Structures are given as structure tokens and as C-alpha cells.
Amino acid sequence: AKLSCKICGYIYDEDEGDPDNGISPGTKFEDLPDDWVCPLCGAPKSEFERIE
Ligand SMILES: [Fe+3]
């Protein structure tokens, strides 16, 4: 699944992960640490919303 950061143009795609910050491809959003934030703008998980 894919989730948009409400606050910038970033999209978290579970099939991409966030590898530059230590999150492997295939990591589900539910499994991101509670201290994970958007790699571009620092918004928390509460500021992401599922998109198609
Ligand atoms: Fe962002």
C-alpha cells in the first residue's frame, strides 16, 4: 500500500520502504517505528494517509 505525507510531496510505498534511513523495502506502515517521520519534512506517522 501507499500513503501520502499530508505536509509535503513524499509518498511512503510499503514496497519501497525508506532505505536511506534504515527501513527496508517491504516494511508495512504498521511496522514503521513510532519514531519514524517523513524523510523530507519530518511529519509524524499521524500525518500520513492511505492513497491508491
Ligand atoms: Fe512530508
Pairing of strands 11-13, 48-51: unpaired
- Annotated binding residue 32: no
In contact, 2 and 35? CB cutoff 8 Å? no
Distance between CA atoms of 14 and 26, rounded to whole angstroms? 5
18: CA distance to ligand 1 center in Å?
A: 13
Nearest to 40, CA basis, from 16, 15, 14, 20:
20
1: CA distance to ligand 1 center in Å?
A: 17
Q: What is the DSSP secondary-structure string of 8-39?
A: SS-EEETTT-BGGGTB-TT--GGGS-TT-B-T
Resolution of the structure in the document, Å: 0.7
What residues have CB less than 8 Å from 43, skipping those under 6 apart? Answer: 5, 6, 7, 8, 37
| Domain extent listing, the chain | 1-52
- Annotated binding residue 24: no
**Which CATH topology does 1-52 take?**
Rubrerythrin, domain 2 (2.20.28)
- Annotated binding residue 5: yes
